[PDB]
């Protein structure tokens, strides 16, 4: 029932609005689209693609948007198995949903799902197997009982997520269970220079700007600390009451979010 | 049942169908059977019957088969409490388990314990993590008071099996109880055929005898060796679908399987 | 219950308690005319056996307000996230009776300084009473509620508790002077008997500042050295006997000859 | 219930919440003119006795919107699976009652590292810290509901939720400087007599390593301390004895005096 | 019982008046007008004969009585320890006049250091469950406590004061000949032994002993002879026994450890 409610229904986001991760998609859409779009080229060799890929990275690194960016692109059912909908009390009422979860998926074709932040349930590695009753132990062993032991299905794509991978089992690095461990990690300069531009489309700044200065001025940072720049940079002009942005404004916007001097250089 | 077998006081394994000893088993005949047989003397002297015993030595000796066996002669309930399988990381709940069993033993009318690997209790405390080692004595110390409080019964006997004696020196717990501490043997070369005579029975094998077996059993003096050689020597006469053993398989068995019983 | 004639030993402290308690209740009009603040609850630190809890049972006998108690660690609980519920369901019972003093004898079980490796629910329910005293709705609760807590050594705790805004005074209950030690004898002796040709200040000056409660031990014990012999009445030399004794053993383990220094 | 004209000091700190909350309801055409939308989130560092909760309750006085009342520990529950539902409840209703504000305080109760425990109860908060994340930024946008969260120490706490997407500015407070102690003192004292002794620019001074909250204790501790002398109005030396007291056990520099 | 105990000629007296005399004779305490005491404490090394004395008092109290050794308090789920402790003192005052025994508290009664843990922090508030009861706002005049310990110099002074422990008592050492002669005569006389009775040959030895070792030697000497298909008597060749009660030789860590 409730599982029918959680469905994507078309958020608006492209792959044009993502930058430095110009190759890490080339692993992600290699497993999702092609077996669902172009399975013949694998078939020309005739092998089993991976299914049940994963992605891990630091926080704010830009992974959730991809998981919805892939939704509008595929024109296929996107399913969100989010938290607070798998670990309800009254045992049997918790782990039945995951059984019912796949059952919708086993029925339907051309289907892919999403598990947001599996660190809740999968991350609950049994504390030395302790606890005479472990409500999460039983419901984690079922999906691997769904996915390993014997084949769940043949055409369904799965992607997990994790801000913190070391929690969950050593059984979720293993075929059937899991195939790939993608790693989103911090950008480089040529990525950042293509993350600024998208967040500054709407912005009403005038040219005379060289973001090459800025990326050399913004060290190791996330893909979300680079939008907050665009807020505060655009904001200082507001308390100073100007109808346009400068470049120098960024230079004292950058100083805050990253945050007395190393005079020895 | 929940915990252990309890043997229904009559499951009668043969304490003499065994290549063990006569002196030790007769040393135990004193502390258990004599009072339960003959209270007319301890009463006459007024001494209370004894308080438990230790049986050191590493395995192969059969330091658990005799125990439940003589318990079967007298007919008490035989159970376990392996201290390796009693420790729990939580603060209490290692002592609770101690408290259940002294109670639950008394829920039954007779009952006797078989603790094993009790060095988990008696540790040297070389780490000295006071968050832990303050508790290690806490659960241990509860044993000392849970074991001999008001219990004036003549049924609730105690045993503790402890490989590696004297590894414990936080406390030797000497004074009072442990009225014996048996000087355990190992299987002497004379006892080999005393042992091989045990398991060889119940077989039609054209004999399968030899004096080249104790030499083979030299340094493999553990009861599992003989149990297993008779096992696998039984698996070689069928290796060719034969009808009866040859003793060369025994001279082959112990020579070629005590290897693991001497290197690891 | 006990009363203020019995808490003798001092006046400066007790004359500072109802400086905050009795006045706002009876007479806030001057303090609303002056109209400045509202000084809330109090803490009183001192070594043990000094009269901390004693003043707190007396005051209830001399309050006219409701006086809620929590003894040592009856708020820490087994299940999760109801210790807090056990708190916020307390103060709501106070505001029903707008003049409401509370009391919690000891906090070093709860309000100890926080860490992350251990200390769970207790460091949470502290982190909401700390809200209730001075939060948004705490401003509502801040009207008429008053608080008393009686630790033993306060360096352990957070500052946030004893931070002013909610703890406006931090009273010391030190061990007394000669005349203070001298009187409370009488407060533990007047029941006794027509004690025969006796002084009691010459003996207090013998026993330098040890504590107060110890003095209840010498007097009760002195009668006992007279109780054995069916000597209902009381002696002099039995006193400097006992007080010279019961502190000896307290001065017995203090010695040590390690002396790695000078 | 309080208002502005009751702080005085915090100005470098206060312009932000204005820019987050009090303003955009008024003149959002500013933000869009650039092509920009304001923050969804705010946080306030600790350094206690410095006026954190005070600021939040101020804006409630004039916001022309719905405002909420939570401390970090109302979220948690007992039945092991109902906590995290409660978080989604408060955010959806705020949307139903939008435009709205929340205020979760002392959330060091909740916010801790992924400690990877073995208890059985400390897990059910980590999930409760997590639906928040999955709710707050998560997968789908939420609209115009703003967070003003607070704490007292963060230097090893509040692991991951502290990032853009969820929170954007991190105001911090400390014990004030000398310049602010001037005007803040005028605040409390603007109802008493102050007979003739004022001299206030030496009363408060550096090396008085005190807070921005103890001053009202000093203000009020003096008046009654003068009242008991049967003198309602006040002089200087009323305050001198007070400052002698309340400062006594804040700090001691016995380990100082080495950097000669 | 009392008569089963040997040389406690001094210690035996203080508790049979600090426990029995009040409930039988209290009007005379207040005939002066004082409050009697509530708690005591029994500190001496093990085997010195402390845990058994109360058991004598248990036979002869005509009150209630409760046995809780200190390890029984703790459990894994916090918060339940103290309510168990609160469950005790309410049970006591209910079935009043009553008293309480504890056989060990050194796992609890300690110095209250500066903790930084849950374990070392939760043990402390257990102890606080006692203090707020033994002297707080709610107290009574029927309970008394019989603490115990193998040694008492570390448990906090806040527990050690009047109002709490008005009368704590010592125990002898292991080298005090007078009672040693009194114990052998006691224990041996309870059963039948030989005429050749060389017990005035053993007392004189310089060795230190308890009341626990004595139960060992005289029992395990009663073992070797009864083991000899004999009936009653114990032969004067128990010289095995005394020398069999030399456990220092059975301590290699007391033989080849420090050197």
């Amino acid at each position: 029932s409730v599982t029918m409610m959680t469905v994507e229904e078309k958020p608006d986001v492209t792959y044009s609005d993502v930058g430095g991760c110009k190759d890490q998609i080339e692993k992600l859409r290699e497993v999702v689209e092609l077996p669902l779009l172009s399975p013949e080229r694998f078939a020309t060799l005739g092998i089993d693609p991976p299914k049940g890929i994963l992605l891990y990275g630091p926080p704010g690194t830009g992974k959730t948007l991809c998981a919805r960016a892939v939704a509008n692109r595929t024109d296929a059912t996107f399913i969100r198995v989010i938290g607070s909908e798998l670990v309800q009390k009254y045992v049997g009422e918790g782990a039945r949903m995951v059984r019912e979860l796949f059952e919708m998926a086993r029925t339907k074709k051309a289907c892919i799902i999403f598990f947001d932040e599996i660190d809740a349930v999968g991350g609950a590695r049994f504390d030395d197997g302790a606890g005479g009753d472990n409500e999460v132990q039983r419901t984690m062993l079922e999906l691997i009982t769904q996915l390993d032991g014997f084949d769940p299905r043949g055409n369904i794509k799965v992607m997990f997520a994790t801000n913190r991978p070391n929690t969950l089992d050593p059984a979720l690095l293993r075929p059937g269970r899991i195939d790939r461990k993608v790693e989103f990690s911090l950008p480089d300069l040529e990525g950042r220079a293509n993350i600024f531009r998208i967040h500054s489309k709407s912005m009403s700044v005038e040219r005379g700007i060289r973001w090459e200065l800025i990326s050399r001025l913004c060290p190791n940072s996330t893909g979300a600390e680079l939008r907050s720049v665009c807020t505060e940079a655009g904001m200082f002009a507001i308390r100073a009451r100007r109808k346009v942005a400068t470049e120098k404004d960024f230079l004292k916007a950058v100083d805050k979010v990253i945050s007395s001097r190393y005079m020895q250089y | 049942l929940v915990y252990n077998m309890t043997s229904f006081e009559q499951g009668e394994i043969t304490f003499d169908g065994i290549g063990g000893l006569t002196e030790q088993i007769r040393e135990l005949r004193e502390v258990i059977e004599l009072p339960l047989k003959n209270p007319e003397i301890f009463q006459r002297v007024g001494i209370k019957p004894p308080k438990g015993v230790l049986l050191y030595g590493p395995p192969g000796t059969g330091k658990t088969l005799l125990a439940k066996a003589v318990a079967a002669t007298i007919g008490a309930n035989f159970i376990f409490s392996p201290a390796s399988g009693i420790v729990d990381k939580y603060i209490g709940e290692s002592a609770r388990i101690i408290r259940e069993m002294f109670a639950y033993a008394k829920e039954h009318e007779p009952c006797i314990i078989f603790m094993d690997e009790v060095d988990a209790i008696g540790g040297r405390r070389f780490s000295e993590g006071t968050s832990a080692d303050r508790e290690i004595q806490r659960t241990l110390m509860e044993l000392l008071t849970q074991m001999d409080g008001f219990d004036n019964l003549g049924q609730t006997k105690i045993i503790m099996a402890t490989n590696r004696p004297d590894t414990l020196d936080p406390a030797l717990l000497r004074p009072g109880r442990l009225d014996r501490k048996v000087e355990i043997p190992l299987p002497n070369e004379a006892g080999r055929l005393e042992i091989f005579k045990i398991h060889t029975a119940k077989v039609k094998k054209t004999g399968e005898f030899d004096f080249e077996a104790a030499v083979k059993m030299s340094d493999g003096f553990n009861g599992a060796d003989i149990r297993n050689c008779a096992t696998e020597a039984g698996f070689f006469a069928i290796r060719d679908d034969r009808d009866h053993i040859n003793p060369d398989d025994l001279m082959k068995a112990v020579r070629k399987v005590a290897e693991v019983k001497k290197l690891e | 219950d006990s009363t203020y004639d019995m808490v003798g030993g001092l006046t400066k402290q007790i004359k500072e308690i109802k400086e905050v308690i009795e006045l706002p209740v009876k007479h806030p009009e001057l303090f609303e005319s002056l109209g400045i603040a509202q000084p809330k609850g109090v803490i009183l630190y001192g070594p043990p056996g000094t009269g901390k809890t004693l003043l707190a049972r007396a005051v209830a006998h001399h309050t006219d307000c409701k006086f809620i108690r929590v003894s040592g660690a009856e708020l820490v609980q087994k299940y999760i996230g109801e210790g807090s519920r056990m708190v916020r369901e307390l103060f709501v019972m106070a505001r029903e009776h707008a003049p409401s003093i509370i009391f919690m004898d000891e906090i070093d079980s709860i309000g100890s300084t926080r860490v992350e490796g251990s200390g769970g629910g207790d460091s949470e329910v502290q982190r909401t009473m700390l809200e209730l005293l001075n939060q948004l709705d705490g401003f509502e609760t801040s009207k008429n509620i008053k608080i008393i807590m009686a630790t033993n050594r306060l360096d352990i705790l957070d500052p946030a508790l004893l931070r002013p805004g909610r703890i406006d005074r931090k009273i010391e209950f030190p061990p007394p002077s000669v005349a203070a030690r001298a009187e409370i004898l009488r407060i533990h002796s007047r029941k006794m008997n027509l004690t025969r040709g006796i002084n009691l200040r010459k003996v207090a000056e013998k026993m330098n500042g040890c504590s107060g409660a110890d003095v209840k031990g010498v007097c009760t014990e002195a009668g006992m050295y007279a109780l054995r012999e069916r000597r209902i009445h009381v002696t002099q030399e039995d006193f400097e006997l006992a007080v010279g004794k019961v502190m000896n053993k307290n001065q017995e383990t203090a010695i040590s000859v390690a002396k790695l220094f000078k | 219930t309080e208002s502005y004209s009751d702080i005085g000091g915090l100005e470098s700190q206060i312009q932000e919440i204005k820019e987050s909350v009090e303003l955009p309801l008024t003149h959002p055409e500013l933000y869009e003119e650039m092509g920009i939308k304001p923050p969804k989130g705010v946080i306030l560092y600790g350094a206690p006795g410095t006026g954190k909760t005070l600021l939040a309750k101020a804006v409630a006085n004039q916001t022309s919107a719905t405002f909420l009342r939570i401390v970090g520990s109302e979220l948690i529950q007992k039945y092991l699976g109902d906590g995290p539902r409660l978080c989604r409840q408060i955010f959806k209703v705020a949307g139903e009652n939008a435009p709205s504000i929340v205020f979760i305080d002392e959330i060091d109760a909740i916010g801790t590292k992924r400690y990877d425990s073995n208890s059985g109860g400390e897990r059910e908060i980590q999930r409760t810290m997590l639906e928040l994340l999955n709710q707050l930024d998560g997968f789908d946008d939420r609209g115009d509901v703003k967070v003003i969260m607070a704490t007292n120490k963060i230097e090893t706490l509040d692991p991951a939720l502290i990032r853009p997407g969820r929170i954007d500015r991190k105001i911090l407070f400390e014990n004030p400087d000398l310049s602010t102690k001037k005007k803040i003192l005028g605040i409390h004292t603007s109802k008493m007599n102050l007979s003739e002794d004022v001299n206030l620019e030496t009363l408060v001074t550096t090396k008085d390593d005190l807070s921005g909250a103890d001053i009202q204790a000093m203000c009020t501790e003096a008046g009654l301390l003068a009242l008991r002398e049967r003198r309602m109005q006040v002089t200087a030396e009323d305050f001198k004895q007070a400052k002698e007291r309340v400062m006594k056990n804040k700090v001691e520099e016995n380990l100082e005096g080495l950097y000669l | 019982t009392y008569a089963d105990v040997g040389g406690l000629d001094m210690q035996k007296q203080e508790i049979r008046e600090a426990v029995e005399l009040p409930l039988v004779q209290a009007d005379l305490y207040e005939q002066i007008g004082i409050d009697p005491p509530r708690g005591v404490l029994l500190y001496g090394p093990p085997g010195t004969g402390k845990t058994m004395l109360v058991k004598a008092v248990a036979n002869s109290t005509k009150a209630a009585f409760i046995r809780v050794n200190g390890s029984e308090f703790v459990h894994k789920y916090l918060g339940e320890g103290p309510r168990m402790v609160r469950d005790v003192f309410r049970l006591a005052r209910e079935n009043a006049p009553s008293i309480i025994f504890i056989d060990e508290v050194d796992s609890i009664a300690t110095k209250r250091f500066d903790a930084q843990t849950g374990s070392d922090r939760e043990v402390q508030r257990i102890l606080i469950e006692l203090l707020t009861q033994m002297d707080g706002f709610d107290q009574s005049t029927n309970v008394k406590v019989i603490m115990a310990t193998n040694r008492a110099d570390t448990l906090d002074p806040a527990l050690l004061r009047p109002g709490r422990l008005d009368r704590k008592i010592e125990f002898p050492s292991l080298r005090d000949r007078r009672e040693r002669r009194l114990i052998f005569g006691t224990i041996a006389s309870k059963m039948s032994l030989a005429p050749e009775a060389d017990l005035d040959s053993l007392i004189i030895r310089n060795d230190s002993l308890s009341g626990a070792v004595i139960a060992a030697i005289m029992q395990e000497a009663g073992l070797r002879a009864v083991r000899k298909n004999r009936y009653v008597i114990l032969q004067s060749d128990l010289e095995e026994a005394y020398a069999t009660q030399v456990k220092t030789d059975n301590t290699v860590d007391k033989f080849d450890f420090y050197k």
Partner: peptide, 16 residues
């Protein structure tokens, strides 16, 4: 059907 399970409703636990 009032087989209302206890819900496995958590609770703290001291460590080590």
């Amino acid at each position: 059907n009032n087989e209302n399970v206890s819900a496995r409703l958590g609770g703290a636990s001291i460590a080590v």
